[PDB]
Amino acid sequence: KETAAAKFERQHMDSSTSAASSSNYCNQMMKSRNLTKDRCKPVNTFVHESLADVQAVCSQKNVACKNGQTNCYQSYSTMSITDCRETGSSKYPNCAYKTTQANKHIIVACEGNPYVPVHFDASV
Ligand SMILES: [Cl-]
């Protein structure tokens, strides 16, 4: 039992690089975060900022989540991110992804004590 907070970090944090350099980033990262183990996770964003900067979002602009709950937060500033989306031809277990590097606001849901990100809702 990974905590929700730990799951968020595994799925979404990539503080080791400033930006995706190559079009193969998503293929590489989705595999190495074990997001293609049982199925190809269809959509996933990686954030290239410090964990502290991402946790800090829980103290920023309170917004509704896509699901209607009101424990989401939008980052005041843009962040370096990489969107990963499975291509239409991708088939498990040969998962393939489209990599898009971007600078966008992130929206995360926060929960707990400490009050930390547990879900990535969207980028703007
Ligand atoms: Cl989950």
From Swiss-Prot:
It catalyses: an [RNA] containing cytidine + H2O = an [RNA]-3'-cytidine-3'-phosphate + a 5'-hydroxy-ribonucleotide-3'-[RNA]; an [RNA] containing uridine + H2O = an [RNA]-3'-uridine-3'-phosphate + a 5'-hydroxy-ribonucleotide-3'-[RNA]. Pancreas. GO terms for cellular component: extracellular region. GO terms for biological process: defense response to Gram-positive bacterium. Disulfide bonds join 26-84, 40-95, 58-110, 65-72. It is found in: Secreted. The keyword Magnesium does not apply. GO terms for molecular function: lyase activity; nucleic acid binding; ribonuclease A activity; RNA nuclease activity. It comes from the Eukaryota. The keyword Signal applies. Keywords: Disulfide bond, Endonuclease, Glycation, Glycoprotein, Hydrolase, Lyase, Nuclease, Secreted, Signal. The active site is at residues 12, 119. Glycans are attached at residues 1, 7, 34, 37, 41. Interacts with and forms tight 1:1 complexes with RNH1. Dimerization of two such complexes may occur. Interaction with RNH1 inhibits this protein. Monomer. Belongs to the pancreatic ribonuclease family. Endonuclease that catalyzes the cleavage of RNA on the 3' side of pyrimidine nucleotides. Acts on single-stranded and double-stranded RNA. This is Ribonuclease pancreatic. It comes from Bos taurus (Bovine). The gene is RNASE1.
